[PDB]
Structures are given as structure tokens and as C-alpha cells.
Amino acid sequence: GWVSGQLRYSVVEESEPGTLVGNVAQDLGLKGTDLLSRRLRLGSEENGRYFSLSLVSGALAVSQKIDRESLCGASTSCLLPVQVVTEHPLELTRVEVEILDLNDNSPSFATPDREMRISESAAPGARFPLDSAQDPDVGTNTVSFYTLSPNSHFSLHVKTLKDGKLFPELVLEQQLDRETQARHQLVLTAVDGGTPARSGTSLISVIVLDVNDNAPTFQSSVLRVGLPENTPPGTLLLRLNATDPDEGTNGQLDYSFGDHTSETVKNLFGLDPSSGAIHVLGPVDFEESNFYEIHARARDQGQPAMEGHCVIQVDVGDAN
Numbered sequence: 310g311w312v313s314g315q316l317r318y319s320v321v322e323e324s325e326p327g328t329l330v331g332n333v334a335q336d337l338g339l340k341g342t343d344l345l346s347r348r349l350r351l352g353s354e355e356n357g358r359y360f361s362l363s364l365v366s367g368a369l370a371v372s373q374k375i376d377r378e379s380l381c382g383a384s385t386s387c388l389l390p391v392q393v394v395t396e397h398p399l400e401l402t403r404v405e406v407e408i409l410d411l412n413d414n415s416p417s418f419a420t421p422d423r424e425m426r427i428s429e430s431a432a433p434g435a436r437f438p439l440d441s442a443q444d445p446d447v448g449t450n451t452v453s454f455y456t457l458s459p460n461s462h463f464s465l466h467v468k469t470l471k472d473g474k475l476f477p478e479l480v481l482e483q484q485l486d487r488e489t490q491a492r493h494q495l496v497l498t499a500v501d502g503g504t505p506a507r508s509g510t511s512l513i514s515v516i517v518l519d520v521n522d523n524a525p526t527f528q529s530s531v532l533r534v535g536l537p538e539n540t541p542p543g544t545l546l547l548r549l550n551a552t553d554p555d556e557g558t559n560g561q562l563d564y565s566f567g568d569h570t571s572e573t574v575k576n577l578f579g580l581d582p583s584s585g586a587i588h589v590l591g592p593v594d595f596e597e598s599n600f601y602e603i604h605a606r607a608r609d610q611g612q613p614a615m616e617g618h619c620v621i622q623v624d625v626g627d628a629n
């Protein structure tokens with residue numbers, strides 16, 4: 310039997326030439342040399358392009374391997390119309406051959422890898438758009454879902470439109486930290502709903518840009534040293550070493566005294582802003598003061614500039 314009004318057959322994508330599509334002669338109620346006597350033929354050479362109608366067997370068969378996505382593309386139903394012509398008397402039957410889709414085509418991305426720059430200060434809940442894959446197959450044989458590589462910081466949300474199209478996007482849950490790791494590498498994978506499933510990948514290399522979120526810190530919180538009375542000027546007391554983990558200018562430092570630092574201390578001690586070398590500039594004396602406290606600070610060359618602090622305790626010795 311056929312569909313009310315028209316004749317219809319089914320054939321599979323990429324099937325080898327010679328495959329039986331359907332017996333036109335029998336289904337059209339003909340037997341014997343009627344076929345040859347009636348000049349049973351396909352309507353045009355476009356019908357005989359993808360098909361052959363034998364005058365002997367009366368069988369409509371595949372004459373050429375048919376790639377459905379080259380004929381219908383993104384069409385759900387692929388009905389290929391052919392015109393079976395018979396003469397004596399002349400009649401025309403319009404037969405429609407549906408090309409059933411095969412899951413022979415794999416999901417693909419435009420680019421094998423993607424590079425994303427994301428600020429360290431990226432707040433949780435931040436959605437970042439991703440490349441969408443393509444699967445020329447139709448139905449469930451096209452892209453079904455996306456999977457992201459297991460990681461600590463990124464989840465995957467896929468917006469599913471009414472039509473069924475998928476849109477993958479990264480959702481940030483745990484705040485990135487460049488000082489921990491600056492590059493996160495994930496693999497976005499697109500999988501179609503066929504069995505067995507076919508896949509495509511896109512290598513997303515997230516780059517964490519530096520934010521000045523770290524103040525400089527000294528190797529020791531408090532430093533207690535000694536300095537003999539009447540120690541000759543030009544003497545190197547010590548060298549300060551503070552370090553900042555941030556990159557570039559955000560990691561470069563400048564050494565200085567505290568704002569509140571006494572003028573007496575400034576007169577006695579000098580401090581190199583670049584190296585962190587604390588020299589004694591003026592002659593110190595025990596009978597003037599017993600103990601000095603130098604508030605040292607190291608400031609970032611970033612915006613805004615941050616600063617760490619260290620207390621240098623100077624015990625002066627007694628002589629006479």
C-alpha cells in the first residue's frame with residue numbers, strides 16, 4: 310500500500326548502488342512485457358540521476374550513493390520526487406522516495422581550540438559564551454548534549470532553545486586565583502544522540518589575568534637587631550626583602566618608612582626605596598635613647614597600590 314493520493318518508498322542514506330528502493334511495476338499493478346511495451350521510464354535524467362528503473366525487473370533501485378545532507382541538508386523529512394512515466398496510454402505517477410538519515414556524520418566545532426582571558430576578580434555566577442558545535446545529521450542524530458572536563462572552578466550550563474538548538478556556556482562558581490594557577494585547560498565535548506554516540510571537541514584554555522589583590526609581605530613580621538653606640542655612619546644595618554606574588558607592575562615594590570616615623574629616626578637611619586637597604590646615617594647614642602622602633606613598609610607599584618609592614622627593633626648598646 311501507499312500514502313493516500315501518492316506513491317512513497319524509503320531508502321537509506323549512503324547505501325550502495327543497486328540497493329532495492331521498491332518495485333514500481335508490482336505496486337503500480339503491471340505484469341510482463343507491459344513494462345517494455347509501455348516504455349516504463351523515469352520522468353527526466355534528474356530522476357535517473359539517483360535512481361534506475363529496470364524494464365526487466367520493473368524495480369526502482371539506487372543508481373548512485375546518496376548523501377542526504379547534500380540533498381536536503383537540515384530538513385527533517387527528505388522526500389525525493391521522481392516521475393514514473395508510462396505510455397500506451399500515457400499516464401504519470403509521482404513517486405516520492407524518502408531518504409532516511411544515517412548517523413554517519415560527526416559533531417564538529419569551527420575551531421579545535423578556544424582561548425579566553427578572564428580577570429581574577431571574576432565574580433561567581435559569571436556566564437561565559439562558548440563555541441557551538443555542528444552536526445549535519447537531522448533528528449536525534451544531531452548534537453544531543455555537551456560535557457565539560459571535570460574541574461574545581463567551572464560548571465557548564467547549556468541554554469536549550471524552543472527549537473531544540475543548544476548553546477553551551479561556562480558558569481563560574483568558585484572565584485579564580487591567578488597566583489594559584491594562571492591557566493585552566495578544559496575540554497568542551499559535543500555528543501549526538503545516536504548509538505554509538507559520535508563526538509567532537511574544543512580545547513578551551515582559560516587565561517587568568519592579574520588583578521592587584523595581594524599586598525607585599527615581609528619574610529619576618531618583626532625584626533629585632535642590635536647596634537653599638539657611636540657606630541660609624543655609612544654602615545649597612547640591614548637589607549629588607551619583601552615579596553609580592555602578583556605579576557608585572559603589580560608585583561614590583563617600593564620600600565619606605567611609616568608616615569608616622571619620627572624625624573629623629575629619619576635623621577639616624579636612611580632607607581633605600583629600591584633595594585630595601587637600611588643604613589645608619591647619623592651617630593646614635595645610648596644616653597639619648599635606649600631603644601628605637603623603625604616602622605618599615607613595602608608598597609605595590611599597582612593600582613590601587615597595596616602595602617605590607619614590618620617592625621625593625623633596634624637595641625643600642627652601652628659604652629662610655
Ligand SMILES: *[C@@H]1O[C@H](CO[C@@H]2O[C@@H](C)[C@@H](O)[C@@H](O)[C@@H]2O)[C@@H](O[C@@H]2O[C@H](CO)[C@@H](O)[C@H](O)[C@H]2NC(C)=O)[C@H](O)[C@H]1NC(C)=O
Pocket residue numbers: 527528550551552553554560561562
Ligand atoms: C628575597 O627577594 C627575592 C627577590 O624578590 C623579587 O624582588 C622583589 C623586589 C619583588 O619584586 C619580588 O616580587 C621579586 O620576586 C625573592 O626571590 C624571588 O622569589 C620568587 C618566588 O616565586 C621568584 O619568582 C623570583 O624569581 C625570585 N627572584 C630572585 C631574584 O631570586 C626571595 O624569595 C626573597 N627572599 C625572602 C626570604 O623573602
Ligand SMILES: *[C@H]1O[C@H](CO)[C@@H](O)[C@H](O)[C@@H]1O
Pocket residue numbers: 500505506507508509
Ligand atoms: C566521542 O568520544 C568521546 C570521548 O572522546 C565520548 O565521550 C563520546 O561519547 C563519543 O563517543
Ligand SMILES: *[C@H]1O[C@H](CO)[C@@H](O)[C@H](O)[C@@H]1O
Pocket residue numbers: 421422496509510511512
Ligand atoms: C578536542 O580534544 C580532542 C582530544 O580530547 C582533540 O583530538 C581535538 O583536536 C580537540 O582538541
Ligand SMILES: [Ca+2]
Pocket residue numbers: 322323376377378413414
Ligand atoms: Ca552523510
Ligand SMILES: [Ca+2]
Pocket residue numbers: 322377378410411412413414445446447
Ligand atoms: Ca547523515
Ligand SMILES: [Ca+2]
Pocket residue numbers: 412413414415416444445446450451452501503507
Ligand atoms: Ca551525527
Ligand SMILES: [Ca+2]
Pocket residue numbers: 429486487488489522523
Ligand atoms: Ca590571587
Ligand SMILES: [Ca+2]
Pocket residue numbers: 429487488519520521522523555556
Ligand atoms: Ca593577582
Ligand SMILES: [Ca+2]
Pocket residue numbers: 521522523524525553554555559560609611615
Ligand atoms: Ca600586589
Ligand SMILES: [Ca+2]
Pocket residue numbers: 538594595596627628629
Ligand atoms: Ca655612650
